[PDB]
Design an enzyme around this catalytic site. Structure first.
Site, PDB file in Angstrom:
ATOM      1  N   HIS A 142       0.832  -1.193   0.000  1.00  0.00           N
ATOM      2  CA  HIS A 142       0.000   0.000   0.000  1.00  0.00           C
ATOM      3  C   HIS A 142       0.872   1.251   0.000  1.00  0.00           C
ATOM      4  O   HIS A 142       0.651   2.189  -0.785  1.00  0.00           O
ATOM      5  CB  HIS A 142      -0.947  -0.064   1.225  1.00  0.00           C
ATOM      6  CG  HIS A 142      -1.815   1.167   1.438  1.00  0.00           C
ATOM      7  ND1 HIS A 142      -3.184   1.165   1.289  1.00  0.00           N
ATOM      8  CD2 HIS A 142      -1.483   2.438   1.788  1.00  0.00           C
ATOM      9  CE1 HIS A 142      -3.654   2.377   1.553  1.00  0.00           C
ATOM     10  NE2 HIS A 142      -2.639   3.181   1.838  1.00  0.00           N
ATOM     11  N   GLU A 143       1.859   1.286   0.890  1.00  0.00           N
ATOM     12  CA  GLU A 143       2.722   2.458   0.998  1.00  0.00           C
ATOM     13  C   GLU A 143       3.543   2.673  -0.266  1.00  0.00           C
ATOM     14  O   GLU A 143       3.656   3.801  -0.765  1.00  0.00           O
ATOM     15  CB  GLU A 143       3.621   2.404   2.242  1.00  0.00           C
ATOM     16  CG  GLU A 143       2.912   2.185   3.582  1.00  0.00           C
ATOM     17  CD  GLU A 143       1.769   3.096   3.844  1.00  0.00           C
ATOM     18  OE1 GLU A 143       1.731   4.186   3.303  1.00  0.00           O
ATOM     19  OE2 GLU A 143       0.883   2.691   4.630  1.00  0.00           O
ATOM     20  N   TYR A 157      -4.345  14.335  -2.777  1.00  0.00           N
ATOM     21  CA  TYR A 157      -4.735  13.545  -1.596  1.00  0.00           C
ATOM     22  C   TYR A 157      -5.859  14.209  -0.803  1.00  0.00           C
ATOM     23  O   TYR A 157      -5.745  14.449   0.394  1.00  0.00           O
ATOM     24  CB  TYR A 157      -3.524  13.269  -0.713  1.00  0.00           C
ATOM     25  CG  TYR A 157      -3.679  12.058   0.209  1.00  0.00           C
ATOM     26  CD1 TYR A 157      -3.789  10.799  -0.306  1.00  0.00           C
ATOM     27  CD2 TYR A 157      -3.625  12.183   1.592  1.00  0.00           C
ATOM     28  CE1 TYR A 157      -3.870   9.677   0.509  1.00  0.00           C
ATOM     29  CE2 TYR A 157      -3.741  11.067   2.406  1.00  0.00           C
ATOM     30  CZ  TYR A 157      -3.846   9.821   1.852  1.00  0.00           C
ATOM     31  OH  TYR A 157      -3.906   8.715   2.673  1.00  0.00           O
ATOM     32  N   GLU A 166      -6.186   6.346  -2.409  1.00  0.00           N
ATOM     33  CA  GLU A 166      -6.249   5.321  -1.363  1.00  0.00           C
ATOM     34  C   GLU A 166      -6.665   3.966  -1.900  1.00  0.00           C
ATOM     35  O   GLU A 166      -6.051   2.956  -1.559  1.00  0.00           O
ATOM     36  CB  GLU A 166      -7.203   5.745  -0.261  1.00  0.00           C
ATOM     37  CG  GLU A 166      -6.514   6.568   0.799  1.00  0.00           C
ATOM     38  CD  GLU A 166      -5.400   5.797   1.420  1.00  0.00           C
ATOM     39  OE1 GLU A 166      -5.632   4.665   1.883  1.00  0.00           O
ATOM     40  OE2 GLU A 166      -4.277   6.288   1.440  1.00  0.00           O
ATOM     41  N   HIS A 231      -9.773   7.699   3.296  1.00  0.00           N
ATOM     42  CA  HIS A 231      -9.740   6.298   3.745  1.00  0.00           C
ATOM     43  C   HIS A 231     -11.130   5.733   3.998  1.00  0.00           C
ATOM     44  O   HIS A 231     -11.264   4.580   4.444  1.00  0.00           O
ATOM     45  CB  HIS A 231      -8.939   6.131   5.053  1.00  0.00           C
ATOM     46  CG  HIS A 231      -7.500   6.509   4.943  1.00  0.00           C
ATOM     47  ND1 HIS A 231      -7.037   7.770   5.258  1.00  0.00           N
ATOM     48  CD2 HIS A 231      -6.416   5.789   4.573  1.00  0.00           C
ATOM     49  CE1 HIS A 231      -5.720   7.807   5.064  1.00  0.00           C
ATOM     50  NE2 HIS A 231      -5.325   6.620   4.632  1.00  0.00           N
TER      51      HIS A 231
END
Ligand SMILES: CC(C)C[C@H](NC(=O)CNP(=O)(O)CNC(=O)OCc1ccccc1)C(=O)O
Ligand SMILES: [Ca+2]
Ligand SMILES: [Ca+2]
Ligand SMILES: [Ca+2]
Ligand SMILES: [Ca+2]
Ligand SMILES: [Xe]
Ligand SMILES: [Xe]
Ligand SMILES: [Zn+2]
Length: 316
Positions: A142-143, A157, A166, A231
């Site tokens: 994910h990162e 973002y 995300e 998120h």
């Protein structure tokens, strides 16, 4: 550092033994020369100054408790590099074999992980909400996928573009988890979240609502928390991706699944050829439809399934 490539051994956060690529020059460093221009893992030493010091070890054996988050950050960065190279013909996050840098032991009791614009950063968790977050292959991937996004579509973002950002990280984090093929699922963070509670996770792609996230555009969050819900509203896109791959009938709309590999091809192409920094959900649908058309043809099942999945989550 300049040195010779070596192979160390250690244990990760979950107690599993694995080999790691290191570099020897007086010490053995967590520097993997076998991938691109290297994968480098650093000790932040419970502080917040980054990156910290390149991880050095006297004997090339990484079995101490303090070593475990570094073992996993380093190893899972390697797996994620391999996924992008072998599956998508992408060389590191910039497509030109940029060195991949990660720091572990960031801060104290830190219940998160992030890409800071230049490197990955992992907390150790507080021991109750999380154990060290590099223990989750989906979290690591994910990162690193945030770096891929930043170098490609550049999704801002916040708000819908940030929820797409995300979801892309959750999608590819999951696809990397399946690629490694150790206990794979469509949940996010289950290996490091809440050591006292079995069976939970940070988010679910198959049923986002299980952890309070929307699974239909009519349930989107419209407030200001979490950068406009990045998120939270990611659940709408995560659900669409899950449906594309696995199929299902959701809010009465039936989707014929096409499998993970085609999901990955379609979304990788959308990310790298069609999405832009300001793309919204409707624009993501269009990008995914066009990507599937390029890959499989306008009359294909794959295109039909992308449309059904976005229909099912209310995105036109
Ligand atoms: C309880 C949490 C673990 C849940 C969540 N985090 C994730 O799912 C993974 N980390 P991530 O999505 O990479 C954070 N990343 C994040 O919040 O981005 C801010 C930023 C922008 C620019 C530079 C540095 C940081 C959160 O942050 O609410
Ligand atoms: Ca050692
Ligand atoms: Ca899993
Ligand atoms: Ca998972
Ligand atoms: Ca748990
Ligand atoms: Xe990558
Ligand atoms: Xe994550
Ligand atoms: Zn993220």
């Amino acid at each position: 550092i300049t040195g010779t490539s070596t192979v160390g051994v250690g244990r990760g956060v979950l107690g599993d033994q694995k080999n790691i690529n290191t570099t020897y020059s007086t010490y053995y460093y967590l520097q993997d020369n076998t991938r691109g221009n290297g994968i480098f893992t650093y000790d932040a030493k419970y502080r917040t100054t980054l990156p910290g010091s390149l991880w050095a070890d006297a004997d090339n054996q990484f079995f101490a408790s303090y070593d475990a988050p570094a073992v996993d950050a380093h190893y899972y960065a390697g797996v994620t590099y391999d996924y992008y190279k072998n599956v998508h013909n992408r060389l590191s996050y910039d497509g030109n074999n940029a060195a991949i840098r990660s720091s572990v032991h960031y801060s104290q009791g830190y219940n998160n992980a992030f890409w800071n614009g230049s490197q990955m950063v992992y907390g150790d968790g507080d021991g109750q909400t999380f154990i060290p977050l590099s223990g989750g292959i989906d979290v690591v991937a994910h990162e690193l996928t945030h770096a891929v996004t930043d170098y490609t579509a550049g999704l801002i973002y916040q708000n819908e573009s940030g929820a797409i950002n995300e979801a892309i990280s959750d999608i590819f984090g999951t696809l990397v988890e399946f690629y490694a093929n150790k206990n794979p699922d469509w949940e996010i963070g289950e290996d490091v979240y809440t050591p006292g509670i079995s069976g939970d996770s940070l988010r679910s792609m198959s049923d986002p609502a299980k952890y309070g996230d929307p699974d239909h555009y009519s349930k989107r969050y419209t407030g200001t928390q979490d950068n406009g819900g990045v998120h939270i509203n990611s659940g709408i896109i995560n659900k669409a991706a899950y449906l594309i791959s696995q199929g299902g009938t959701h809010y009465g709309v039936s989707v014929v699944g096409i499998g993970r590999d085609k999901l990955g091809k379609i979304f990788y192409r959308a990310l790298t050829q069609y999405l832009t920094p300001t793309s919204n959900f409707s624009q993501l649908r269009a990008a995914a439809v066009q990507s599937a058309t390029d890959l499989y043809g306008s009359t294909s099942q794959e295109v039909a399934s992308v449309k059904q999945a976005f229909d099912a989550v209310g995105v036109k």
